[PDB]
Design an enzyme around this catalytic site. Structure first.
Site, PDB file in Angstrom:
ATOM      1  CE  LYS A   1      53.862  28.330  44.149  1.00  0.00           C
ATOM      2  NZ  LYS A   1      55.265  28.241  43.606  1.00  0.00           N
TER       3      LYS A   1
ATOM      4  CB  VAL B   1      50.252  19.270  50.705  1.00  0.00           C
ATOM      5  CG1 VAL B   1      48.966  18.221  50.717  1.00  0.00           C
ATOM      6  CG2 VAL B   1      50.159  19.736  49.261  1.00  0.00           C
ATOM      7  N   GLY B   2      50.381  22.654  52.096  1.00  0.00           N
ATOM      8  CA  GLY B   2      51.330  23.715  52.660  1.00  0.00           C
ATOM      9  C   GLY B   2      51.623  24.697  51.420  1.00  0.00           C
ATOM     10  CB  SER B   3      53.001  27.809  51.805  1.00  0.00           C
ATOM     11  OG  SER B   3      54.548  28.180  52.264  1.00  0.00           O
ATOM     12  N   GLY B   4      53.809  27.230  48.892  1.00  0.00           N
ATOM     13  CA  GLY B   4      54.803  27.199  47.953  1.00  0.00           C
ATOM     14  C   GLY B   4      55.382  28.464  47.736  1.00  0.00           C
ATOM     15  CB  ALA B   5      58.047  29.918  45.660  1.00  0.00           C
ATOM     16  CE1 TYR B   6      58.223  34.589  45.444  1.00  0.00           C
ATOM     17  CE2 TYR B   6      58.347  33.742  43.229  1.00  0.00           C
ATOM     18  CZ  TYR B   6      58.947  34.331  44.188  1.00  0.00           C
ATOM     19  OH  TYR B   6      60.377  34.578  44.222  1.00  0.00           O
TER      20      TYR B   6
ATOM     21  CG  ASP C   1      59.983  26.831  45.866  1.00  0.00           C
ATOM     22  OD1 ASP C   1      59.633  26.663  46.953  1.00  0.00           O
ATOM     23  OD2 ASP C   1      59.142  26.799  44.818  1.00  0.00           O
TER      24      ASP C   1
HETATM   25  N1  LIG Z   1      53.264  17.755  47.639  1.00  0.00           N
HETATM   26  C1  LIG Z   1      53.613  18.512  46.747  1.00  0.00           C
HETATM   27  N2  LIG Z   1      53.969  17.721  45.690  1.00  0.00           N
HETATM   28  C2  LIG Z   1      54.676  18.291  44.725  1.00  0.00           C
HETATM   29  C3  LIG Z   1      55.029  19.803  44.602  1.00  0.00           C
HETATM   30  C4  LIG Z   1      54.629  20.483  45.911  1.00  0.00           C
HETATM   31  C5  LIG Z   1      54.951  21.936  45.958  1.00  0.00           C
HETATM   32  C6  LIG Z   1      55.009  22.883  45.214  1.00  0.00           C
HETATM   33  C7  LIG Z   1      54.606  22.966  43.673  1.00  0.00           C
HETATM   34  C8  LIG Z   1      55.598  23.372  42.644  1.00  0.00           C
HETATM   35  C9  LIG Z   1      55.115  23.579  41.354  1.00  0.00           C
HETATM   36  C10 LIG Z   1      53.797  23.005  40.967  1.00  0.00           C
HETATM   37  F1  LIG Z   1      53.551  22.891  39.799  1.00  0.00           F
HETATM   38  C11 LIG Z   1      52.888  22.218  42.009  1.00  0.00           C
HETATM   39  C12 LIG Z   1      53.493  22.193  43.436  1.00  0.00           C
HETATM   40  N3  LIG Z   1      55.276  24.103  45.604  1.00  0.00           N
HETATM   41  C13 LIG Z   1      55.643  23.840  47.122  1.00  0.00           C
HETATM   42  N4  LIG Z   1      55.407  22.581  47.163  1.00  0.00           N
HETATM   43  C14 LIG Z   1      55.731  21.768  48.442  1.00  0.00           C
HETATM   44  C15 LIG Z   1      57.043  21.319  48.792  1.00  0.00           C
HETATM   45  C16 LIG Z   1      57.056  20.728  50.005  1.00  0.00           C
HETATM   46  N5  LIG Z   1      56.548  21.429  51.160  1.00  0.00           N
HETATM   47  C17 LIG Z   1      55.345  21.799  51.197  1.00  0.00           C
HETATM   48  C18 LIG Z   1      55.277  22.427  49.692  1.00  0.00           C
HETATM   49  N6  LIG Z   1      54.150  19.687  46.757  1.00  0.00           N
END
Ligand SMILES: Nc1nccc(-c2c(-c3ccc(F)cc3)ncn2C2CCNCC2)n1
Ligand SMILES: C[C@]1(C(=O)NC[C@]2(N)[C@@H]3C[C@H]4C[C@@H](C3)C[C@@H]2C4)CN(S(=O)(=O)c2ccc(N3C(=O)CCC3=O)nc2)CCO1
Ligand SMILES: [Ca+2]
Ligand SMILES: [Ca+2]
Ligand SMILES: [Ca+2]
Ligand SMILES: [Ca+2]
Ligand SMILES: [Cl-]
EC number: 2.7.11.24
Length: 344
Positions: A48, A25-30, A163
């Site tokens: 993540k 479901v996409g990239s996150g920070a780092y 983030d």
């Molecule tokens: N779908 C979803 N739901 C919750 C969080 C995230 C998430 C996290 C993240 C952070 C901490 C963690 F412990 C787990 C996940 N980092 C980026 N994102 C998304 C935020 C929305 N765009 C896609 C990436 N994505």
């Protein structure tokens, strides 16, 4: 737990059998994120995997930073942790970190883009951002790059900030003092961002869509007016000060002539957020008391954070020291109760 391996986003994830049906479901920070099903609780989660968390002193400290921050954040409008895990059986094997939070389906861009929002719905979205900001700001944590893509939202418009406290990024929502590297700033950098977001929820259009930092500043000054000499105090670069000082003087616009057909309370709040003088900008706690949010405001449900010890930020440690500290924080993590709330 027994772990299994699955290739996701062209790399091997190793996760406990508890978490099933992983899907990117996409990239996150780092790192990068998968949705998953938590078979222990029947809840949907987001996992993540941090990318190369201990590759360098920069990765190692940012891994520790993020884990410490997320272990501290316990607020309904801020991303926090349900779990943190590693396939490592010991510190000597420790090279991968996975963070687990409740699944949120979208970001704020998914809300506004195909939807004519009502004012009551805009109130709810902005209210939640401000509630989360009051909490993080109370722990002396600032976001600094708050924007729609850093606001996770679910199918019921519940919102969480992510983030905070941490590739070409959009600058359209950044506070001028951040975008232009001015010498002093406070927590209200994030309030400028809220103003930019709120304006876009009301009109459907980016407020300051500048092509570069100078174009964006010019757009900003057209709305808020030319700054006084006192603002130059904050700007180190002489060429930057000379340039701003040289621009033709512009008056502040009356926002009531800008946001046409908007709730007058929304316009008044925007006037209090979109001010260049960051010492005159409204705070998150003050904004929560504004009449725009009257139907949502509840002082008993707008909590502050426990004190947050950031002394580690000033320290240079070796990679293996950040790694060991991070391992300690993985091992000491205590998962929260599934139900942490009660009727008011
Ligand atoms: N779908 C979803 N739901 C919750 C969080 C995230 C998430 C996290 C993240 C952070 C901490 C963690 F412990 C787990 C996940 N980092 C980026 N994102 C998304 C935020 C929305 N765009 C896609 C990436 N994505
Ligand atoms: C803010 C606005 C706009 O001028 N943008 C131009 C700027 N970027 C530019 C010039 C000055 C100063 C700087 C630089 C900031 C802006 C204003 C406004 N226009 S609107 O008039 O077409 C409209 C569009 C919609 C609405 N609306 C509703 O329809 C309900 C509530 C509400 O606000 N109200 C008005 C759409 C685009 O965004
Ligand atoms: Ca007013
Ligand atoms: Ca309530
Ligand atoms: Ca309950
Ligand atoms: Ca109450
Ligand atoms: Cl964004």
């Amino acid at each position: 737990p027994t772990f299994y391996r699955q290739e996701l986003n062209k790399t091997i994830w190793e996760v406990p059998e508890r978490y099933q049906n992983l899907s990117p479901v996409g990239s996150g920070a780092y790192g990068s994120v998968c949705a998953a099903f938590d078979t222990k609780t029947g809840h949907r989660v987001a996992v993540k995997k941090l990318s190369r968390p201990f590759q360098s002193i920069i990765h190692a400290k940012r891994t520790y930073r993020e884990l410490r921050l997320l272990k501290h954040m316990k607020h309904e409008n801020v991303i926090g942790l349900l779990d943190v895990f590693t396939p490592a059986r010991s510190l000597e094997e420790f090279n991968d970190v996975y963070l687990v939070t409740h699944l949120m389906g979208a970001d704020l861009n998914n809300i506004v883009k195909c939807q004519k929002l009502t004012d009551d719905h805009v109130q709810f979205l902005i209210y939640q951002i401000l509630r989360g900001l009051k909490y993080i700001h109370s722990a002396d944590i600032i976001h600094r790059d708050l924007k729609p893509s850093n606001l996770a939202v679910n199918e019921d418009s519940e919102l969480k900030i992510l983030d905070f406290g941490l590739y070409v990024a959009t600058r359209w929502y950044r506070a001028p003092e951040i975008m232009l590297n001015w010498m002093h700033y406070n927590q209200t950098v994030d309030i400028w961002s809220v103003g930019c977001i709120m304006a876009e929820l009301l009109t459907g259009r980016t407020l300051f869509p500048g092509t570069d930092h100078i174009d964006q500043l010019k757009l900003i000054l057209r709305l808020v007016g030319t700054p006084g000499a006192e603002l130059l105090k904050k700007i180190s670069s002489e060429s930057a000060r000379n340039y701003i000082q040289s621009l033709a003087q512009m008056p502040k616009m009356n926002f009531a002539n800008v946001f046409i057909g908007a709730n007058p309370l929304a316009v008044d709040l925007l006037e209090k957020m979109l001010v260049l003088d960051s010492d005159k900008r409204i705070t998150a706690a003050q904004a929560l008391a504004h009449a725009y949010f009257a139907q949502y405001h509840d002082p008993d449900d707008e909590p502050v954070a426990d004190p947050y010890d950031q002394s580690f930020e000033s320290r240079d440690l070796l990679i293996d020291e950040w790694k060991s500290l991070t391992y300690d924080e993985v091992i000491s993590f205590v998962p929260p109760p599934l139900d942490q709330e009660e009727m008011e």
